[PDB]
Design a protein around this ligand. Structure first.
Ligand SMILES: O=c1ccn([C@@H]2O[C@H](COP(=O)(O)OP(=O)(O)O)[C@@H](O)[C@H]2O)c(=O)[nH]1
Ligand SMILES: *[C@@H]1O[C@H](CO)[C@@H](O)[C@H](O)[C@H]1O
Lengths: 365, 39
């Protein structure tokens, strides 16, 4: 029982680590190629036909219209999520001076918009932060890298400032080395997807193995939303780092939780392989984190946590590689250069002349 | 609608889901669609 499980897992680790190749030949990644595969695949469907004015006018309904015209940024007056627009604008505004004219339909909603099982004049292009293979949306680094992530008691202005978060968590990961971390599964979050339930219920049944509780979110409708338990307190990102085994789950789409876990130098257990952000592709299972299939069972959790508790060096090696990957390949510079490379490649697809639109408002700079 | 799940209202605001969109209720001192602006 325990032995077959161990063979299976160790076999997967060895194979994933034998087959692994760095995302860039040089660790500093000067030509911003680490995440290049994802932007190529997202843009590929437009390579032969390109993007016509009509395609854009048709896609406008699916997001906020942004326009670079004459090195100036314009936008629909109405942004659905102003804080998210501000976060996006932090990255576009410094690139506008050195970018050709283009129209961008940027979806600032959680869920993507271009279902490829519809298609449909769901042809796009539309930019969204998260998607699965079911959607044509082009991924972009989320607003929250600067501003406008979910708002909590500890972060009332929205989770943001990834640059400051990186320093904070680096210092905290150094303060709590592996040996000092509690040997327990940890998760603290709201019930934005029912894939999260089995870990919470396992925690209620075996609190010495897993510490997992539901918080209350702004969409709370009834106590079913915490599986009939009193809402738990928020726990800071820094305090996640006192645990060895940190769980991550999709929410409505991908969760901004994930990136924060790696910087604790804790072992990240990532549940599900469907919902993506632009950097997920180069995070490789068994190299940087422990993958679990969707809707994990309580027994799966018990087996996998037991295995790693008994193979602590292994646990630490994956944790360290996870940490190293995010430290080196999700810098602010990586976020900035991905945006730039994305917009530079996108513009070449345009098969029309961008014209002013006077109903749009001037954003900057 | 399920847009409030992702906590779109800042600075202590509360959220209600319509069918199309969401709406924030902002405490005294804050305003804007997301309670992002000082009153
Ligand atoms: O105690 C908590 C609860 C949530 N979060 C963060 O707040 C955001 C919202 O988390 P939630 O689980 O409510 O929604 P999700 O985005 O995971 O669907 C995420 O970035 C979490 O990492 C946090 O830091 N501490
Ligand atoms: C709430 O919103 C954020 C992004 O909007 C996302 O991280 C979650 O998937 C959603 O629950």
């Amino acid at each position: 029982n325990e032995d077959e499980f161990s063979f299976k897992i160790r076999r997967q680790i060895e194979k994933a680590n034998a087959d692994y190749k760095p995302c860039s030949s040089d660790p500093q990644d000067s030509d911003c190629s680490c995440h290049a595969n994802v932007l190529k695949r997202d843009l590929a469907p437009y390579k032969s036909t390109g993007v016509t004015r009509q395609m854009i006018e048709s896609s406008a309904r699916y997001g906020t219209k942004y326009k670079i015209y004459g090195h100036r940024l314009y936008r629909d007056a109405n942004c659905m999520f102003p804080a998210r627009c501000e976060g996006i604008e932090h990255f576009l505004l410094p690139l506008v001076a050195t970018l050709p004219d283009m129209d961008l339909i940027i979806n600032t909603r959680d869920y993507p918009q271009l279902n490829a099982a519809w298609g449909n004049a769901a042809g796009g292009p539309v930019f969204s932060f998260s998607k699965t293979k079911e959607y044509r949306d082009i991924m972009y680094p989320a607003w929250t890298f600067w501003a406008g992530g979910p708002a909590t008691k500890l972060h009332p202005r929205g989770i943001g400032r990834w640059d400051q978060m990186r320093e904070k968590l680096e210092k905290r990961a150094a303060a709590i080395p592996w040996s000092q971390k509690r040997s327990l599964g940890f998760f603290r979050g709201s019930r934005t997807s029912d894939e999260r339930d089995s870990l919470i219920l396992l925690s209620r049944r075996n609190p010495e193995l897993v510490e997992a509780q539901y918080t209350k979110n702004q969409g709370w409708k009834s106590p079913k939303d915490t599986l009939d338990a009193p809402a738990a307190d928020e726990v800071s990102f820094e305090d996640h780092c006192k645990y060895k085994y940190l769980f991550n789950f999709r929410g409505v789409a991908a969760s901004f939780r994930l990136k924060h876990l790696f910087l604790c130098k804790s072992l990240v257990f990532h549940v599900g392989d469907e919902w993506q952000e632009f950097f997920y592709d180069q995070l490789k299972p068994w190299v940087h984190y422990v993958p679990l299939k969707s809707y994990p069972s309580q027994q799966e959790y018990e087996h996998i946590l037991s295995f790693f508790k008994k193979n602590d060096a292994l646990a630490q090696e994956i944790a360290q590689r996870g940490y190293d990957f995010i430290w080196e390949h999700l810098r602010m510079k990586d976020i900035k250069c991905y945006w730039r490379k994305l917009l530079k490649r996108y513009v070449k697809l345009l098969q029309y002349e961008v014209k002013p639109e006077d109903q749009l408002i001037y954003i900057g700079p | 609608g399920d847009q409030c799940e992702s906590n779109p209202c800042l600075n202590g605001g509360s959220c209600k889901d319509d069918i199309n969109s969401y709406e924030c209720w902002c405490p005294f001192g804050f305003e804007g669609k997301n309670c992002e602006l000082l009153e």
